[PDB]
Design an enzyme around this catalytic site. Structure first.
Site, mmCIF file in Angstrom:
data_model
loop_
_atom_site.group_PDB
_atom_site.id
_atom_site.type_symbol
_atom_site.label_atom_id
_atom_site.label_comp_id
_atom_site.label_asym_id
_atom_site.label_seq_id
_atom_site.Cartn_x
_atom_site.Cartn_y
_atom_site.Cartn_z
ATOM 1 N N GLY A 177 10.983 1.343 6.275
ATOM 2 C CA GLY A 177 9.991 0.102 6.507
ATOM 3 C C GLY A 177 8.946 0.389 5.656
ATOM 4 N N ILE A 178 8.735 -1.005 4.778
ATOM 5 C CA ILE A 178 7.693 -0.978 3.706
ATOM 6 C C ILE A 178 6.342 -1.450 4.601
ATOM 7 C CG2 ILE A 178 8.332 -3.033 2.724
ATOM 8 C CD1 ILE A 178 6.877 -2.371 0.307
ATOM 9 N N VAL A 179 5.227 -1.187 3.998
ATOM 10 C CA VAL A 179 3.956 -1.532 4.764
ATOM 11 C C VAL A 179 2.861 -2.246 3.525
ATOM 12 C CG1 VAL A 179 1.943 -0.774 6.168
ATOM 13 C CG2 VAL A 179 4.153 0.636 6.117
ATOM 14 N N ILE A 206 0.886 -1.108 0.031
ATOM 15 C CA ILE A 206 -0.058 -0.008 -0.126
ATOM 16 C C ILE A 206 0.855 1.282 0.032
ATOM 17 C CG2 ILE A 206 -1.950 -0.923 1.041
ATOM 18 C CD1 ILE A 206 -1.100 -0.291 3.797
ATOM 19 N N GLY A 207 1.940 1.289 0.661
ATOM 20 C CA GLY A 207 2.714 2.245 0.693
ATOM 21 C C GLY A 207 4.357 2.097 1.168
ATOM 22 N N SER A 208 5.190 3.125 0.909
ATOM 23 C CA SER A 208 6.543 2.815 1.049
ATOM 24 C C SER A 208 6.941 4.125 1.980
ATOM 25 C CB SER A 208 7.413 2.652 -0.082
ATOM 26 O OG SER A 208 7.092 1.595 -0.655
ATOM 27 N N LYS A 234 4.104 -3.515 8.868
ATOM 28 C CA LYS A 234 5.171 -2.691 8.376
ATOM 29 C C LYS A 234 6.487 -3.705 8.802
ATOM 30 C CE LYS A 234 7.476 1.795 9.305
ATOM 31 N NZ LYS A 234 6.871 3.153 9.883
ATOM 32 N N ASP A 237 7.803 16.832 14.930
ATOM 33 C CA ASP A 237 7.970 16.492 13.236
ATOM 34 C C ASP A 237 6.637 15.977 12.842
ATOM 35 O OD1 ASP A 237 9.176 16.606 10.936
ATOM 36 O OD2 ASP A 237 10.303 14.777 11.201
#
Ligand SMILES: O=C(Nc1cnn(-c2csc(C(=O)NC3COC3)c2)c1)Nc1ccccc1Cl
Length: 334
Positions: free
Chosen positions: A28-30, A25-27, A45, A141
């Site tokens: 650690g990768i998940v 779904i998205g980039s 993740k 942050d």
């Protein structure tokens, strides 16, 4: 026999067999997956060798620890943590599992949202930050790429902020407060600037303060809000003071010009909400933290207060690779 299986999703995910139908779904990768034990969809993740250097190690370890110090619906909570490796000597990867969401806040910011939706997202961002502040955690942050949303408008903040050098192909600095840009002392309302940077991007659909480095970024802040007062300069280190005072001055545009009514919605209700939104903005995007609104006062701004009283291994110093590996491994297996 084995409890784990491996699937190629450019990375290799070695996960417990309860988790099925993995997909990126998205980039650690998940990855997203179905958890057959809980009968629900999760996100997974992968942290690859988080002990490989001090930056990855410090963040992996603190975020593993700080999980157990927070319990708030607007703050990530883990359903599971595991490693497929069987021993410390073999340890390589950490897998983190949470509720699967529907979108990243970046995607949401690109959409037109009514004031109900915008104000509820902000209310939730402020609850989360207040809860982090209650537990002695000041993020510093906050940025949208680390906030996720579900279709029902509910929101979760996924990270815990700052505690460097990155040897890999970048960090997003555009939502950082002037205190962070310029290395000043900070307090809780450092995180309000970030919320205001998100809120403003929700309206303008452009990053408020872009730039290659803090140099450009500061230019964008001053050009738009004006040069801060001398009372602000006195809080600066003498070297950064010289830098700041000798930049070209700027009067600073008013907030109606920065966020004109064209960016807001047809009804008296929406007219009133637009002026309240601009007002909140003007209290959040304030360079001087002395005059910047607080989390508590923001939560009771009329734009936000429409949404509830119910909604009220300590940080370690530098270590080596081997020590970080063991600290992280121990945490993974309590
Ligand atoms: O990013 C993380 N979590 C997270 C959860 N949901 N999403 C998400 C973004 S988009 C999207 C989506 O498209 N879902 C569609 C597909 O069916 C609906 C889902 C990302 N990180 C994280 C993961 C586990 C532990 C700790 C951490 Cl920090």
């Amino acid at each position: 026999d084995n409890q784990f299986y491996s699937v190629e999703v450019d990375s290799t995910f070695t996960v417990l067999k309860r988790y099925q139908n993995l997909k990126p779904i998205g980039s650690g990768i998940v990855c997203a997956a179905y958890d057959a034990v809980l009968d629900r969809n999760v996100a997974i993740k992968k942290l690859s060798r988080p002990f490989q250097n001090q930056t990855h190690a410090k963040r992996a370890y603190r975020e593993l620890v700080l999980m157990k110090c927070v319990n708030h619906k607007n703050i990530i909570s883990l359903l599971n943590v595991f490693t497929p490796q069987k021993t410390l000597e073999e340890f390589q990867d950490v897998y983190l599992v949470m509720e699967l969401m529907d979108a990243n806040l970046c995607q949401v910011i690109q959409m037109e949202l009514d004031h109900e939706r915008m104000s509820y997202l902000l209310y939730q961002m402020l609850c989360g930050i207040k809860h982090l502040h209650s537990a002695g955690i000041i993020h510093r942050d906050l940025k949208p790429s680390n906030i996720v949303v579900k279709s029902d408008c509910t929101l979760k903040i996924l990270d815990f902020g700052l505690a460097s050098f990155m040897m890999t192909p970048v960090v997003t600095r555009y939502y950082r407060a002037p205190e962070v840009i310029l290395g000043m002392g900070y307090k809780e309302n450092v995180d309000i600037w970030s919320v205001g940077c998100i809120m403003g991007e929700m309206v303008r659909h452009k990053i408020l303060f872009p730039g290659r480095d803090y140099i450009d970024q500061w230019n964008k802040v001053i050009e738009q809000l004006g040069t801060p007062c001398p009372e602000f300069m006195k809080k600066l280190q003498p070297t950064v003071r010289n830098y700041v005072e000798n930049r070209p001055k700027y009067a600073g545009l008013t907030f109606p010009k920065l966020f004109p009514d064209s960016l807001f919605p047809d009804s008296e209700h929406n007219k009133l909400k637009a002026s309240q939104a601009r007002d909140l903005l003007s209290k959040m995007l304030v360079i001087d933290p002395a005059k910047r609104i607080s989390v508590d006062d923001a939560l009771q701004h009329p734009y936000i207060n429409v949404w509830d009283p119910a909604e009220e291994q300590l940080d370690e110093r530098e270590h080596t690779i081997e020590e970080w590996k063991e600290l992280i491994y121990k945490e993974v297996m309590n």
